[PDB]
A paper describes a structure:
The Na+,K+-ATPase generates electrochemical gradients of Na+ and K+ across the plasma membrane via a functional cycle that includes various phosphoenzyme intermediates. The enzyme is a binary complex of a large α-subunit of the P-type ATPase family responsible for ion transport and enzymatic reaction and a β-subunit acting as a chaperone and functional modulator. Furthermore, regulatory FXYD proteins may associate with the complex in a tissue-dependent manner.
Structural rearrangements in the BeFx complex because of Rb+ binding and occlusion were followed by soaking E2–BeFx crystals. Two datasets were collected at 6.9 and 7.5 Å maximum resolution (consisting of 11,991 and 9616 unique reflections, respectively) at a wavelength of 0.814 Å with a strong anomalous signal for Rb+. Indeed, the datasets for Rb+-soaked E2–BeFx (here referred to as quick soak and long soak corresponding to 10 mM, 20 s and 50 mM, 3 h, respectively) produced strong anomalous difference peaks (5.8–8.4 σ) at the cation-binding sites, reflecting exchange of Mg2+ with Rb+. For the two quick soak conformations, one protomer was fully occupied, whereas the other showed partial occupancy (with an occupancy less than 0.1 for a second site, assuming a full occupancy of a first site). Interestingly, the anomalous difference peak for the partially occupied quick soak protomer overlapped with the Mg2+ site between the two K+ sites I and II, suggesting that initial Rb+/K+ binding takes place at this exposed site prior to formation of the properly coordinated K+ (or Rb+) sites. For simplicity, the protomers will therefore in the following be referred to as the initial (Rb)E2–BeFx binding form (quick soak conformations), the early (Rb2)E2–BeFx binding form (long soak protomer 1), and the late (Rb2)E2–BeFx binding form (long soak protomer 2) when discussing structural changes. K+ binding associates the extracellular part of αM4 to site II, most likely through main chain carbonyls of Val322, Ala323, and Val325 engaging in coordination. In the initial binding (Rb)E2–BeFx form, this results in αM4 tilting ∼7° toward αM6. Although only qualitative, the occupancy analysis revealed that the initial (Rb)E2–BeFx binding form has only partial occupation at site I. Furthermore, the anomalous difference suggests an overlap of the initial site with the Mg2+ site.
Numbering used by the authors:
A (entry chain G): 17 to 48
B (entry chain B): 15 to 303
C (entry chain A): 21 to 1016
The structure:
Amino acid sequence: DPFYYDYETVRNGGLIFAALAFIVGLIIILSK
Amino acid sequence: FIWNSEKKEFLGRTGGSWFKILLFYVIFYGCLAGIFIGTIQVMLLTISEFKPTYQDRVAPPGLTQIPQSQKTEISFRPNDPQSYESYVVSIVRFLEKYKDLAQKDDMIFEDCGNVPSELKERGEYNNERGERKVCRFRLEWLGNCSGLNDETYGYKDGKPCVIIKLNRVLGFKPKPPKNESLETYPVMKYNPYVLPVHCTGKRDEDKEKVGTMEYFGLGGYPGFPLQYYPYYGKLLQPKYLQPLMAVQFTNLTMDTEIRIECKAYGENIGYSEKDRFQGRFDVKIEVKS
Amino acid sequence: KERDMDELKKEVSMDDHKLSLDELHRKYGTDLSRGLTPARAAEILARDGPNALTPPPTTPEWVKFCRQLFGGFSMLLWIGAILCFLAYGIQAATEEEPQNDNLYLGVVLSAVVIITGCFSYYQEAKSSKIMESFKNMVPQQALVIRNGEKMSINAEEVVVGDLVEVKGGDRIPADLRIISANGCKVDNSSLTGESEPQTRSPDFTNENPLETRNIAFFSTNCVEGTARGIVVYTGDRTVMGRIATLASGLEGGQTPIAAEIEHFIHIITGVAVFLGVSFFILSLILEYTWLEAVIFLIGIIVANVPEGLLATVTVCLTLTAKRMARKNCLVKNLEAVETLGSTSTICSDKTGTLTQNRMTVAHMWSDNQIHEADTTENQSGVSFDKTSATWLALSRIAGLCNRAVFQANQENLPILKRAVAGDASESALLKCIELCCGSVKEMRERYTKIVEIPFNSTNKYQLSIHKNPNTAEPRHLLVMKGAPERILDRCSSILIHGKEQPLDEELKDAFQNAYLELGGLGERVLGFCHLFLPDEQFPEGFQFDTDDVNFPLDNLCFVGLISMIDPPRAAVPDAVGKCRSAGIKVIMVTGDHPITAKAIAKGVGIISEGNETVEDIAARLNIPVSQVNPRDAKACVVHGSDLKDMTSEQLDDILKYHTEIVFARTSPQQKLIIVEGCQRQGAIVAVTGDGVNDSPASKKADIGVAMGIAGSDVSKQAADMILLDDNFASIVTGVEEGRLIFDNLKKSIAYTLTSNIPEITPFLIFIIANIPLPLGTVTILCIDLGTDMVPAISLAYEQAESDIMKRQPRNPKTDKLVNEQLISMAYGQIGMIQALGGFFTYFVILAENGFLPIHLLGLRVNWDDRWINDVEDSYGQQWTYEQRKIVEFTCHTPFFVTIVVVQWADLVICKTRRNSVFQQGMKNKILIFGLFEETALAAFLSYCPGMGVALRMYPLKPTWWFCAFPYSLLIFVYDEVRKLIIRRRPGGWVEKETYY
Ligand code: BEF
Ligand SMILES: [Mg+2]
C-alpha cells in the first residue's frame, strides 16, 4: 500500500547523522 | 538629536539619495521574488497532477458527522423550532448535492448496483481514459431520515438522528474484516461486500447505556458499499457522491446527557488514542425538553 | 544641603600653619613639650570622633541582586515577560489552552532573565570576592605625649591638639603642625605624589599647605629622623580624609557600551511597537470584531523582540574578560572591558604609577664621561662597561660607606624590588652595588670600620676609615661622599685608570657642567671621593677616634659623581609608543615637581623628544617669557599654580592648542577637573594611578585604573579597573581588545537579528492571507534561543580583519554599534531571502502531501477549527483534525531546519564584515564546532522518539533538508560579491549604503 511509511529507519538514521556530526566537532574543538 | 526631521538638503534620516536606496530595494525584492517564484514553479511541475505524491499521513480514515456540531454535542429542544436550526440547515446543505434530479446527466453518471457490489475498477489512475462516470445515490437508501416524503423532515426533531460519512481517501479500496471477525459484536453474516460501523453508550467499561439504535443502508445493511471505492480524486470525478450512512437514536432519556462512540472495523481501518476521530467517532447528545 | 558639601570638596583646602608657636599655644590650649593632661583628652576624644575615617559609607546588602535584574535590555525585556502573561490572560479564563502555552513562555522569559542576571552577578561577585583578599591594614599606633609622659596609645584614642612624636618607621597617625624635628624626612608619595623623600621642619616655608614643611599628612610614613609637632586635623577632617570621601562620593559615569546597548534598545523596541502594535490595529482594522481580533497579538508581536541575545551578549563579554583575567588585570564590572578600545585620551600619574616609586641609580661620572646604568625592574636593559678601575674604586667606596642593610628574607626576590631598611640614597646605592659589582656581604665585612661620621649638620660629608686587605700598599683607606659644590671645595687630587692627578680648572668646569647637566636632567647627584693615609704618619695599629682631625681633610682624591632618579616601570615606554601610534593623546598629570616631571616625561615620550614648551623657547632666545606666542610651542608645561587661577574655555584652549601636555603640582582634587576637562571635549578618558590623589580622578573617569601592590586603598576601590602585576604593558592589550570585541559583537548582533525576519514574517502573513501557521513558537524558541546560541557565541572569537592598533579611536557619536546600515542589511536583505527559503520550504510540504499553494488561500479558518474533520484539498481528500495539525507541526519543524541552513550562510558571511571568507578562512574552530553542533541539536530534535509527543515536532522526510540549499547559497553569494566590491571601490556607492 502507498499508505505506510518506514519512519523508523530514517529516524534510526538522522540520529546517526546527528552523533557523527556532533562528534566530528568534538574532534574539531580539541585539536590537542 | 531627536529633531532630524527636515535637515538641510535632507529629510528625516537621509533623502538626497533616497532614489538610490529605494531603487535598489525594488530590483532586489523584484529579484528576490523572480528567484523564489522560479523555485515554487519548479516545485509545481514535480507534483503529480493526478496522484498525491505523499499519502501516508491519512493512513487511518475517520468517521465524521453530518451535523458537525460545536463539540459533537447535539443539544436541542424537540419543541422550539429554532433550537434545532443550526443543525438541520447544516444537514440540508450537506446532501443538497444528492437529489436525483441534480444527477440527471447520464453523460457523467451511471446507474450502479442497488445492492453492495464489488470494486468498480475503472482502469488506472492516469488520464488515458476519459472522465469517469460517478455511481449515483438516491436519498432512498437513507430511510425515515430524508428518505424522500415518508417521514423525515423534522430531521430528528423527535428521536434524534445523524448520518456518518467516511473521509474520501484517493484510492482507498477499504478492506473490511474477514468472516473470522476478531470480535465485531452483533452484525449479520454479510461480511463480504460492505464495511461496518456501530455505536456505544460508553467505551470499554460500565456505561450509562440508555439507547436503542436503528441503522439505514443500501438495501438495508449497516456500513459502506464497496461499489464506490476508492475515490479517483476531484479532478477525475467531480460532483462525486460518496457513501453516507445513517444511525438513529429512538429510546432516549430526554433531560439527561449520555455519550456515544461509533467505531469502524477493518484491517483497512485503524484507530488513534490521541485522535478520537481516527477510525472511530464521538458524539454526545442531550434531548433537553 | 549636601551638594554644597560636595562642592567645598572639589575646592582647594585651607588652613593656618603660619603662626608663632606661641600663637599656636594660644588657640588650641595645650603645652609644647608637656602637652595636654589626660582628663582633657578624655574630654576631646568624645566631643566629636576618634581619629578615624567614617567607614566606607557604601554597604549594600545581598538584595543589591535586583541590580543585574533590570538595567537597560533586561528591564527592556522585563515588560515582555509581563506582556506574555498579559497575553496569557484570556487563555486562563475563556476555556482555551493556558495549561501549557503562554505560561511556560513566561517562566522561560523569567528564567532566561533570571539566568542572564544570576550569571552576570555571580562573576561580578567572584571579582568583588578576589579583591577583598588584598587589604592587609596593619593598624599603626601613635606615639602621643600626654602629661609630659610619651604614651603610645592605640591609633584610635588620640585628639586634635596634643603632641605626637614620630620616629623612623611610625606611620603618621593624623595631620600635625611640626613644632620640632631632627633630620625628619617623611614620605608623602602616597598622598600628593612627591617622589624622593621630603625633609620636615617647624619654620614656615611655602603656603600651599601640601608642599609646606611644617605639616605632615595621614597615610604617609615618616622615613628617617624624629620630630615633634601638634595635631591640627583629626579623623575625617584630614586631607586624605577630605579626598577618600569625595572619591567615595562621585558617580561611576555611564560606559560607552551599555550606551550602544541603549540606542540598540531604541531601534529594537523602536520599530517593535512602531510596527507590531500598529500592525495588529490593522488586524481589527480589516473587519475582525475587536473581541477576538487581538486574541493572537500576545505572541505574534512577541517574536519581533529577539529573546536570547540577552544571554549571547553577557557571554561575548564574559569570554573576553576571562582572557584579560589571564594576563593580570581585573575588571570590577563587566562592561568596562570594552571601554579602553574607545579611548582617545589617557591621563596617567607619575609616581607609584608610571614609575616604581623606588630610588635607583641612574647615571655615573668617571673619566670625564657619563654612563647610563640599567634602570628597569626586570634587568632587561643596558649594563655599563664595568672593566675600568675608576669603577672598581668608586664601587667599594659606596659599598663600604652606608648605614643601609638587607633584611633576612631578601634573597630569592629580584635584587631591585626587594626590601631595604635604610635611607633612599643609601638604599639605591647599596642597590646598584650588589647588582653591578658582585656581592656586598663579603666586601663590607672585609674592611673593619674604625670610626664613622653619619650625615652631619654643617657642610655635607659622611665618612669612614678602614685598613688594607690588599697586598700592595698597606696604607690606610679613607672614603667620603658629599655635595658636588661642598666636596669640590675641599678636594684637589683626581683619579683615572689607577693613578692620581690634581684639580685643573678645565675639567673642574667640565665637572661644573656635567653636574649641572646630570643634575638638570632631574637626577639628584652625589660626588664620591677617597684618599690614602700617609701610613708613615698613622701606623698599621693606631685606632683613631672621633674628637679631632686625624687625617688630611684636603688634597683628597675625587672619583666620580653618581646620579639616581625614580625610574619608569620597564614596560612603560613601549606601551606609550603604541599609545600614540593608535592616535591616543597621552597627557601627563602629576603632583610632582616640574623639573623632575620635565625629565621623566621627555624620557617616556608623552612629550616626544622635541617639542619646546613655552619656557624652553624663552630662555634659549634669552627674552622675557611674556614675549613668545604660545601658538609656537607644540608642547607645554603648566605649573598647578596657574591652574587654580583658571576657567573652562581656557582649559579648553590648552588641551586644544597643545598636543603634548604635562600638568605638574596638582592637588588630588585638581585631577578631577582635568578628567572633567578632557571630558568637556566629548572624548572618553582612561585614568591610571597609584596613591590617593587619584581616587577622585580615578572615579570620574569613564574608567579608572589602579595599581595592585604599589597602590594604596582609596583609588583601588574607585577606579573601574586594577593592574595586579603592576605590568603597564598590559594596557596595550586593553585598547586592542575593547576595539576588537567592538567589531565582533557587531557581527554577533546581526546574526540573531537576521533570524528575527523569517521569525515574525510567518506570524505576519498568517494573518494576511488566512493560511495555516507556517512556524511555531516552540520553533521560535530553539533559534533565538536554542540552536542560534552557540554560533552567536562562536562569532565572538572571530579575529582581526586589518591592523587594529592602526586605526584611530572611535567617535562616540558617529560609529554606531548598531547603525542604520546593519538593519538595512540584517532586517533589509538577508532575513528577506531568509524568509524566502523557509516559506519555499513551507509550500513544497503542504503541496507534496496534497495542499496546492493557490489552494491554501483563506484556509486557516476551517483549519484552526478543532471540529472540521472533513477538509478537502485540491485533490479532494478529506482530512481530520490531528491529521492536518500533524502536517502543521511538521511544517513547523523543517522551516526551522531550513532556518539553521541559511543561518549557515549567515554565520559564515557575518564572520567577516569586509574580507572575503577565503582570505580570512575557517580557522575559527568553535565556529566549525558551531556548524556541527547546531546541525546536530537540530537533527537530534526532529528524529528523537516521542518528540512529536512532547514539543509538537516530528521526523522529516528526507527530501526536505536540501530545500534551503540554493538560498543559503545565493545568500553566501550575495554578501560575498558584496564584500568584494567594497574591497575594490569603497569610495563610490556600495560601501556607504551597506557596510554595517
Ligand atoms: F602620583 Be602622581 F605623581 F600625581
Ligand atoms: Mg603617583
